[PDB]
Write an enzyme that holds these catalytic residues in place. Sequence first.
Site, mmCIF file in Angstrom:
data_model
loop_
_atom_site.group_PDB
_atom_site.id
_atom_site.type_symbol
_atom_site.label_atom_id
_atom_site.label_comp_id
_atom_site.label_asym_id
_atom_site.label_seq_id
_atom_site.Cartn_x
_atom_site.Cartn_y
_atom_site.Cartn_z
ATOM 1 C CD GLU A 11 -4.317 -2.375 -3.301
ATOM 2 O OE1 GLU A 11 -4.165 -3.619 -3.123
ATOM 3 O OE2 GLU A 11 -3.719 -1.843 -3.145
ATOM 4 C CB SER A 63 0.139 -4.931 5.477
ATOM 5 O OG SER A 63 -0.165 -5.843 6.188
ATOM 6 C CB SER A 88 -1.504 -0.025 0.885
ATOM 7 O OG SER A 88 -2.149 -1.079 1.100
ATOM 8 C CE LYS A 111 -4.199 0.578 -1.660
ATOM 9 N NZ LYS A 111 -4.092 0.401 0.232
ATOM 10 C CB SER A 163 -4.452 1.730 3.884
ATOM 11 O OG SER A 163 -3.405 0.706 3.207
HETATM 12 B B1 LIG Z 1 -2.128 -2.332 2.023
HETATM 13 O O1 LIG Z 1 -0.674 -2.462 1.533
HETATM 14 O O2 LIG Z 1 -2.879 -1.599 3.478
HETATM 15 C C1 LIG Z 1 -4.091 -2.389 3.312
HETATM 16 C C2 LIG Z 1 -4.094 -3.116 2.198
HETATM 17 C C3 LIG Z 1 -4.115 -4.624 2.941
HETATM 18 O O3 LIG Z 1 -4.326 -5.365 1.505
HETATM 19 O O4 LIG Z 1 -3.011 -2.871 1.109
#
Ligand SMILES: *[B@@]1([O])O[C][C]([C][O])O1
Length: 261
Positions: free
Chosen positions: A139, A210, A43, A46, A103
């Site tokens: 995602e 994560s 993430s 992002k 997130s």
């Molecule tokens: B990112 O890494 O932060 C939370 C989400 C879980 O899929 O992605």
Amino acid sequence: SAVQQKLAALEKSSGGRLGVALIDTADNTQVLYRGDERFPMCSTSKVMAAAAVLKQSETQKQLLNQPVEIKPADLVNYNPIAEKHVNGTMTLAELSAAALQYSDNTAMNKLIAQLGGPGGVTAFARAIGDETFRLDRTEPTLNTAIPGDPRDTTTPRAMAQTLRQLTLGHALGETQRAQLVTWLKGNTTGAASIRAGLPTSWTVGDKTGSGDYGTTNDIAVIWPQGRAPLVLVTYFTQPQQNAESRRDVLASAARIIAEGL
Ligand SMILES: *[B@@]1([O])O[C][C]([C][O])O1
């Protein structure tokens, strides 16, 4: 140096692979640990997607207010904010905030779509001088974090430089940069990561990540009270696919960095 010996020891104690990059904007000095190795972004990617949309808004002045429909088919595995707006709309600003501060994975996928796919996110990185970042997937599959897989990776050094440019530099317009900083400062997912290794008086803006392989990441801009800001990237991944997250490693790495200043 002392800090690199302490980071190596922290890594050895953790069982995983740690990547750190610190930029001190006071003297543009850098501290790097595995700074040119690739790590799965998860993430933390992002930030790049949101900043790309912000760049678009420099020409399309109303873009962030554009409503985007959230349909049930859009929902993926982790959608804390988008779930609240199923069968309704969210603006691009709201989606950007959601992706960054919560997130939200659906939000990220809408940002990617707005940019014309993962290649559009990557292109923005290239346009601001980041030759390392690559976003390959949407995602949730960009979080697979498979050892050795170069998809959806960057290096600590690259991400630190890019985060500096986006937040403290002028890769974005003035209103856009300020908006990004506001978004990062309001992150809700970071309390146990970099922030936990820093003085409570410091202002932090960060984005966590994560993923599988116990991948546990955080990228931050840090405004110490009466002191030039710092940019700190901490990436951590482990050898077991089902390993648990280790936010404490990122807190410890931040503490070690902070001690050396
Ligand atoms: B990112 O890494 O932060 C939370 C989400 C879980 O899929 O992605």
